[PDB]
């Protein structure tokens, strides 16, 4: 029995929607003043699980409480199909007649994309007949009354193009994944009535750590965490086989109970296709945070929409370049992507172009560019452009170059790319896309001594000198940080692991100095040139 | 139910030729028996969606029903004659035709006939072939039906059984195309008739040429949306209440801001599934290239005189220039936009390959068949110096063969742009353009006057806003240093200049940003 109070973050959509079904039933003077007859159709579309059906449910439960009462008719996917010849095209006629009978009313076709395909001469004739009848009923010779029609879809572009037209489906709403702010609202909604109410700062801490969560996942963990406390509190519930009596007064949910949940479940977005955005792992942050910050500063310089009347920008492009093994293509760029949230990202990599056996690559490239143009601002991402170039045929090069030349100049679509070879060795076609004079090239340099010292500071001496369940190690740290002054990222994080293996090889020894010599031996056996 | 040939705007030929089939044989019956005519009694409307096909039938019914000469009216939906029993599918048709014959004169209106009369084939059910056979044996058979007028309407004309398209069954075919600049003013007039503060026609006239690509129903939407926007501008506390308020219907007047916002929030129904290859100059760039666009239009007026009847012979033209001068991305699309009312058929790289499930040659032939059918038109081939390198020999031969068979005097322009100068183009492309005839145009850089016009509004007016001798020095310096920059560099300089004006919004005193503007002027360097 939800009534415009279980939603969070969809405020303009609801405001526009109520203008379509509420006002003429309430203020029948302004419309008659001008002879308007407001729009009477809409189409929802967006990725799964973002609250497409809940809005319709809330609106239905809201308007049924008259006066003024409004009917409501629901239809599933393809319910009006029969094996007889003249039945499928008659149920719609019956339904529309019945709806006209009790006007005003609402007809909600649910997942219309499985009912009204694009007409073609190859598929069966029943579909063409049904779509013709459907679009003859909506706007025909005789005018329908106060019926209002709604649709749901996951793939917009597969609806017949004649249905989308002022008169039948004259407004399209985009339902997106929630941004940072809306996650807090959804969490407040789902944990409203709890006797030990959580504090809001805790909710914000949760919200800043949920990236890629879509409406139903947040609802999921709020119930996968209220069960961890139960399983911890009364561990002996699965053993017996009859109903017990409990003490439902000592099972409040602690902060820890949340953490395990975020470790176990994976968001709906990244279940069939991996996402090209990953935050820095807990070990390397004190090696690369500063470089990420500098990169974001420069991008802020050229792409002004990353600031947090409108800003004006002219074809933003940038290229992150350095010697091989400097973490440019495997640590830095995905970190930058993860830092700029609220801008959707479309990727372009060899595993993605050739990862589809049913569509040619140029089709995929065209689709990606069109989508990025549609929901701009956004990011088009292409990594390893020095290997990417000489794998693809000439047709795809020409197509890719001609598509991004048609994007309007002041439209905000960023082009982010990374490479290994220095800028001068790249093929000249790539060269005439980045204009460093304008500030579109960033060079990466190795971390300095302080930063590398911080990298090994917690390994030695805080874990090696921990009781199981103090002066030689300083010289050990000095010799370690002296030895590795010319190591790239791969070799550094290699040498981190070999020490931790010795750390783990001595769990239960209470006496040290049986491994300190082992440690200093291993560090001087390790040789990577 | 008060629409009668007076709410319909822009279609005069179709109305004029439609009343001489159903009005004249009744009213002046003494002219046709002299010659033994029996004037035509079958027509087929067709055209892209939302262009006013059902409106005409509504008007015609409403007109003929009320008057001195009464004519009946039977209406049918898509496939509303079907029944499950074997003997009833085609019996309703016979019942309807007999009933219409009994009350003659009368009219029959088949709506969405493409959903009832598919082209006969043996790859489907056989009931459809039975229905088609009884229909086309019933319209003109052995019985001479008499005074029955049959009408259809559809979007896909090519999917109708060809035995129904020949005189006797469906005589005339009517094309309903999108309105041009003049008819949009008529439609806007029609839809804003009963407004007490009547808008000035000097405002509608301006409003018309901004609505490019709109068609029919879209217009009727805008005239609605504006009103609602106006309401949002007057009583903004109305969306946050669950109880009726007291509204004063006297301060809900419509202003141009409402039209501007409502127009911005909407896209036309035509270019919603695809994108049209014609776009006007943006407001930012307009005072740099309008003169050049006018010059190009004058050359077209020289060789393509459709911009006694004018005569033309295989019109062609080629815009050429050094890279960056803006001929493939700023000039040619503007030319296509100005020459509207000429249907355009784009033909370049992402169109030929960017759609699968078809071969390049099929599309390459279809795009020219359509251009020939709807002459005059335009065939558009941008970036020829690359387009000629990415295709196989089969496509070259098919292309250079498909445009030789067009009738020599047919007015089918071929508009293309290049970047390498005409001498460096390969053979078979220098022979298609014969610049002695006047088929090559050389574009050149803008001179000083428009360059100064380009910057004065930003650096003189906008730089001094409420929330003055050094400005002239800045303007003269900027204009001077930039006497060899192409379009891309000029726009980039504009953007970097406006960035500081943005970033210093909230400081109540100037002279902190003037230094910024300076350093950006000095610290900006180009390549050339
Ligand atoms: N803002 C929100 N507040 C509360 N619940 C939400 C919100 N957004 C989404 N949901 C959840 O979304 C679920 C269903 O929404 P809806 O079915 O319309 O979208 P969807 O599941 O992503 O799409 P589809 O119907 O195509 O599968 C409900 O379980 C609801 O709890
Ligand atoms: N010239 C016009 N003046 C006013 N309204 C117009 C005009 N042309 C079209 N319309 C609008 O177009 C609407 C629909 O026209 P009509 O239904 O006959 O077109 P159609 O070809 O059948 O379109 P569809 O593809 O929707 O079937 C009318 O209700 C009217 O509001």
- Other CB atoms within 10 A of residue B19 CB: 15
- Spatial CA neighbour of A464 closest among A497, A503, A502, A517: A503
For this entry, resolution in Å reads: 3.8
Give the list of residues 6+ apart from residue A11 with CB closer than 8 angstroms, or none.
none
B49, B91 Cβ separation under 8 angstroms: no
- Identify whether the C-beta of residue A379 lies closer than 8 Å to the C-beta of residue A337: yes
Q: What is the DSSP letter of A459?
A: I
User: Per the structure block, which two tokens stand in for B103?
Assistant: 């009350």
Cα separation, B91 vs B228, in Å, equals 50
Residue B118 near chain A (CB below 8 Å): yes
Each residue of B397-432: b (16+ CB within 10 Å) or e? Answer: ebbeebbeeeeeeebbbbbbbbbeeeeebeeebeeb
Calculate Rg over the CA atoms of chain B. Answer: 30
Q: Which residues contact A241 (CB under 8 A, 6 or more apart)?
A: none
Ligand closest to the CA atom of residue A192: 1
Instruction: Please work out, in degrees rounded to the nearest 5, the angle formed at the alpha carbon of residue B236 by the alpha carbons of B235 and B237.
Output: 90
**B440, two tokens:** 């090559």
| Chain A residues whose beta carbon lies within 8 Å of the beta carbon of residue B383 | 402
Q: Is A453 annotated as a binding residue?
A: no
Which of A176, A189, A188, A181 minimizes the C-alpha distance to A210?
Answer: A181
How far, in Å, are A9, A11, A97, B52, B369 from residue A55 at the CA level? 12, 11, 26, 35, 48
A55 Cα to the center of ligand 1, angstroms:
8
Helix (H, G, I), strand (E, B) or coil at B370: helix
Q: Within 13 Å of residue A211, how many CA atoms lie on the same side as its CB?
A: 15
Separation between Cα atoms, residue A107 and residue B174, nearest integer Å: 35
Parallel, antiparallel, or unpaired for β B148-154 and B343-346?
unpaired
Cβ–Cβ gap A85/B80 under 8 Å: no
Annotated binding residue B152? no
Alpha carbon distance B472, B478 (integer Å):
10
Q: Does A18 appear as a known binding residue?
A: no
Q: Which two tokens stand for residue B128?
A: 């459809």
Two structure tokens written together for B5: 């040939």
Q: Is A475 helix (H, G, I), strand (E, B) or coil?
A: helix
Q: State yes or no: cis peptide before A104, omega within 30 of 0.
A: yes
On chain A, the residues whose CB falls within 8 A of the CB of B499 are: 304, 311-312
- Is B141 annotated as belonging to a binding site? no
Q: Which residues contact B486 (CB under 8 A, 6 or more apart)?
A: B322, B324, B325, B326, B445
Minimal CA separation from B312 to chain A, in Å: 33
The answer on whether A77 is annotated among ligand-binding residues is no
User: How far apart, in whole angstroms, are the C-alpha atoms of residue B141 and residue A217?
Assistant: 67
Residue B48 marked in a binding site = yes
Closest-approaching ligand to the CA atom of A137? 2
Helix axes A216-224, A180-190, angle to 10 degrees: 50
Output the CA B277–ligand 2 centroid distance in Å: 25
Q: Which residues of B touch A87 (CB under 8 A)?
A: 84
Contact (CB, 8 A) for B277 and B335: no
* Nearest ligand (C-alpha, residue A269): 1
- Gaps in chain A with C–N over 2.5 Å, residue before each: 308, 469
User: Whose CA is closest to A131, among B78, B117, B45, B76?
Assistant: B78
> Are B467 and B505 a contacting pair, CB within 8 Å?
yes
The shortest CB-CB distance from A314 to any of B221, B353, B495 is to: B495
Q: Give the separation between CA B160 and CA B156, rounded to whole angstroms.
A: 8
Q: How many helices (H) and strands (E) does chain A have?
A: 21, 10
Q: Give A354-386 as a DSSP string.
A: TT-SSS-HHHHHHHHHHHHHHT-SEEEEE--HH
Beta bridge partners of B416: B318, B381
CB of A518 within 8 A of CB of A472? no
Q: Check CB contact of B114 with chain A, cutoff 8 Å.
A: yes
**DSSP-derived 3-state class of residue A347:** strand
Strand order in the sheet with A172-174: A73-75, A105-109, A147-151, A41-45, A172-174
Separation between Cα atoms, residue A460 and residue A462, nearest integer Å: 6
Separation of A385 CA from ligand 1 center, angstroms?
39
The number of helices, as runs of H, and strands, as runs of E, in chain B is 20, 10
Within 10 Å of residue A207's Cβ, how many Cβ atoms? Answer: 21
How far, CA to CA in Å, does B160 sit from each of B113, B132, B165, B168, B172? 8, 10, 8, 16, 14
∠ at Cα A360 (A357, A365), nearest 5°?
A: 120
Paired tokens of A477: 């740290």
Distance of CA B451 to the CA centre of its chain: 33
The greatest distance separating any two alpha carbons of chain B, rounded to the nearest whole angstrom, comes to 94
Question: Do the strands B316-320 and B441-442 form a parallel or antiparallel pair, or are they unpaired?
Answer: parallel
Closest-lying ligand 1 atom to the alpha carbon of residue A52: 18
8 Å CB contact of A29 and B386: no
Closest CA to B8 of B47, B56, B46, B42: B56
Q: Which ligand is nearest to the CA of A213?
A: 1
Residue A46 counted as an annotated binding residue: yes
Tokens for A347? 């990727």
> What is the SS3 string spanning B22-75?
HCHHHHCCCCHHHHCCCCCCEEEEECCCCCCCHHHHHHHHHHHHCCCCCCCCEE
Q: Rounded distance, CA A107 to CA A91, Å?
A: 14
List CB contacts of B99: < 8 A, sequence separation 6 or more: B74
What is the distance in A from the centroid of ligand 2 to the CA of A140?
A: 10
Q: Is A25 on the interface with B (CB under 8 A)?
A: no
For residue B97, count CB atoms less than 10 angstroms from its CB and return exposed for 0-12, middle for 13-18, buried for 19 or more: buried
User: Can you tell me the distance from the alpha carbon of A51 to that of A9, in angstroms, rounded to the nearest whole number?
Assistant: 10
**Measured distance between the N- and C-terminal CA atoms of chain A, rounded to whole angstroms:** 68
Q: Reduced to 3 states, what is the DSSP secondary structure of residue B347?
A: coil
Task: Establish if B82 touches chain A: CB-CB under 8 angstroms.
Answer: yes
A13 touches chain B (CB under 8 A): no
For ligand 1, residues with CB inside 6 Å are A 6-9, 48-54, 154, 186, 189, 215-216, 219
Helix (H, G, I), strand (E, B) or coil at A140: coil
Angle between helices B514-522 and B470-481 (to 10 degrees): 20
- Residue A344 CA to chain centroid, in angstroms? 7
Is B32 an 8 Å CB contact of chain A? no
Residue among A77, A80, A84, A78 nearest A95 (CA): A80
Report whether A70 contacts A197 (CB < 8 A).
no
Query: To which residue do tokens 């791969």 refer?
Result: A490
DSSP alpha helix (H) spans, B103-178: 127-138
What is the DSSP-derived secondary structure letter of residue B166?
S
Interface check for B130 against chain A (CB to CB < 8 A): the answer is no
Partner residue opposite B227 with nearest CB, options A34, A87, A165: A34
User: What is d(CA B495, CA B520) in angstroms, rounded to the nearest whole number?
Assistant: 11
User: For residues A510 and A500, what is the distance between their CA atoms, to the nearest angstrom?
Assistant: 18
Residues 6+ apart with CB under 8 A from A294: A442
CA distances from A150 to A94, A112, A203, B241 (A): 18, 9, 35, 24
* Rg (alpha carbons) of chain A, rounded to whole number: 30
CA of A229 to the centre of ligand 2 (A): 63
CB A439 within 8 A of CB A319: no
Name the residue of B18, B216, B223, B272 to mutate for ligand 2: max ligand atoms within 8 A of Cβ: B216
Give the residues surrounding ligand 2 with Cβ less than 6 Å away: A 139, 162, 165; B 8-10, 47, 49-55, 153, 155, 187, 190, 216-217, 220
If phi > 0 it is left, if psi is from -120 to 50 it is alpha, else beta; for residue A318 that is beta
A512 burial via Cβ count (<10 Å: 0-12, 13-18, 19+) = middle
A51 is in an annotated binding site: yes
**How many Cα neighbours within 13 Å face the side chain of A18?**
18
Are A397 and A362 a contacting pair, CB within 8 Å?
A: no
Residue of B nearest to A167 (CA): B217
Whether residue A330 contacts residue B521, with contact meaning beta carbons closer than 8 Å, is answered with: no
Q: What are the distances in angstroms from CA B115 to CA A18, A89, B122?
A: 36, 11, 18
Residue A49 alpha carbon to ligand 1 centre in Å: 5
Give the chain B residue nearest A128 (alpha carbons).
B115
A window 391-450, beta carbon within 8 A of B: 394-395, 398-399, 402-403, 405-406, 408-410, 435, 437-438
Cross-strand partners of A346:
A380
CA distance A448 to A445: 9
Helices B201-210 and B181-191: angle between axes, nearest 10 degrees: 130
- Which residues of chain B neighbour A394 with C-beta distances below 8 Å? 390
B216 Cα–ligand 2 center, Å: 6
Nearest atom in ligand 1 to the alpha carbon of residue A9 is: 1
Among the partner residues B218, B224, B502, nearest to A36 by beta-carbon distance:
B224
CB pairs under 8 A between A and B: 164
Q: CB count, 10 Å around CB of A451?
A: 15
The residue nearest atom 25 of ligand 2, judged by CA position, is B49
- CA pseudo-torsion sign B260, B265, B266, B271: positive
Ramachandran class of B112: left when φ > 0, alpha when ψ lies in -120 to 50, beta otherwise:
left
Kindly give, in sequence order, each residue whose CB lies less than 8 Å from that of residue A477, ignoring residues fewer than 6 positions away. Answer: A453, A456, A457, A460, A461
Please tell me the residue having the least CA distance from ligand 1 atom 14.
A51
Is the separation of the CB atoms in A8 and A185 below 8 Å?
Answer: yes
Whether A30 and B247 lie within 8 Å, measured CB to CB: yes
Decide if B152 touches A, using CB distance below 8 A: no
DSSP track, A299-335: HHHH-GGG----------EEEEE-STTSSIIIIIHHH
> Nearest 5°: phi and psi at A509?
-85, 125
């Amino acid at each position: 029995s939800v009534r415009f109070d279980s939603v969070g973050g969809l405020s303009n959509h609801i405001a526009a929607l109520k203008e379509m079904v509420v006002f003429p039933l309430l203020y029948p003077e302004v419309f008659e003043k001008f002879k308007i007859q407001p729009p009477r159709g809409c189409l929802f579309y967006g990725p799964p699980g973002t609250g497409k059906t809940l809005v319709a449910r809330a609106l239905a439960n809201e308007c049924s409480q008259g006066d003024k009462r409004v009917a409501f008719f629901m239809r599933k996917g393809a319910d009006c199909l029969s094996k007889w010849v003249g039945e499928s095209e008659r149920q719609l006629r019956l339904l529309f007649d019945q709806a006209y009978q009790m006007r005003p009313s609402i007809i909600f076709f649910d997942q219309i994309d499985g009912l009204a395909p694009v007409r073609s001469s190859r598929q069966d004739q029943i579909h063409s007949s049904i779509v013709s009848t459907l679009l003859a009923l909506m706007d025909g010779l005789d005018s329908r009354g106060e019926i209002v029609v709604i649709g749901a879809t996951n793939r917009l572009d597969s609806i017949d193009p004649a249905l989308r037209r002022p008169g039948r489906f004259d407004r399209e709403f985009l339902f997106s994944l929630p941004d940072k702010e809306a996650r807090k609202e959804i969490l407040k909604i789902h944990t409203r009535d709890w006797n030990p109410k959580p504090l809001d700062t805790f909710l914000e801490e949760l919200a800043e750590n949920c990236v890629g969560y879509c409406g139903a996942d947040i609802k999921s963990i709020c119930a996968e965490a209220a069960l961890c406390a139960l399983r911890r509190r009364y561990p002996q519930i699965y053993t017996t086989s009859e109903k017990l009596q409990l003490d439902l007064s000592s099972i409040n949910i602690s902060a820890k109970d949340f953490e395990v949940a975020m470790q176990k479940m994976i968001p709906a977005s990244q279940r069939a296709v991996t996402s090209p955005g990953q935050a820095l792992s807990t070990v390397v942050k004190p090696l690369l945070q500063n470089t990420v910050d500098k990169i974001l500063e420069a991008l802020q310089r050229v792409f002004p929409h990353a600031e947090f009347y409108q800003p004006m920008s002219f074809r933003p492009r940038i290229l992150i370049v350095g010697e091989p093994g400097f973490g440019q293509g495997s640590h830095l760029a995905p970190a930058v992507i993860h830092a700029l949230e609220k801008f959707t990202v479309y990727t372009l990599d060899i595993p993605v172009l050739f990862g589809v056996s049913t569509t040619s690559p140029e089709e995929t490239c065209a689709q990606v560019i069109r989508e990025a143009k549609r929901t701009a601002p956004s990011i088009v991402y292409v990594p390893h452009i020095h290997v990417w170039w000489e794998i693809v045929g000439p047709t795809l090069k020409a197509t890719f170059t001609t598509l991004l030349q048609n994007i309007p100049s002041f439209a905000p679509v960023l082009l982010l790319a990374t490479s290994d070879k220095p800028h001068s060795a790249l093929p000249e076609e790539v060269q005439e896309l980045f204009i460093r004079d304008y500030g579109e090239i960033f060079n990466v340099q190795l971390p300095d001594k302080e930063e590398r010292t911080k990298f090994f500071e917690d390994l030695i001496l805080k874990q090696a000198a921990k009781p199981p369940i103090h002066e030689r190690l300083k010289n050990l740290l000095k010799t370690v940080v002296k030895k590795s002054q010319n190591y790239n990222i791969f070799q550094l994080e290699n040498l981190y692991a070999v020490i931790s293996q010795c750390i783990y090889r001595h769990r239960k020894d209470h006496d040290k100095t049986s491994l300190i010599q082992k440690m200093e031996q291993e560090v001087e056996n390790f040789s990577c040139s």
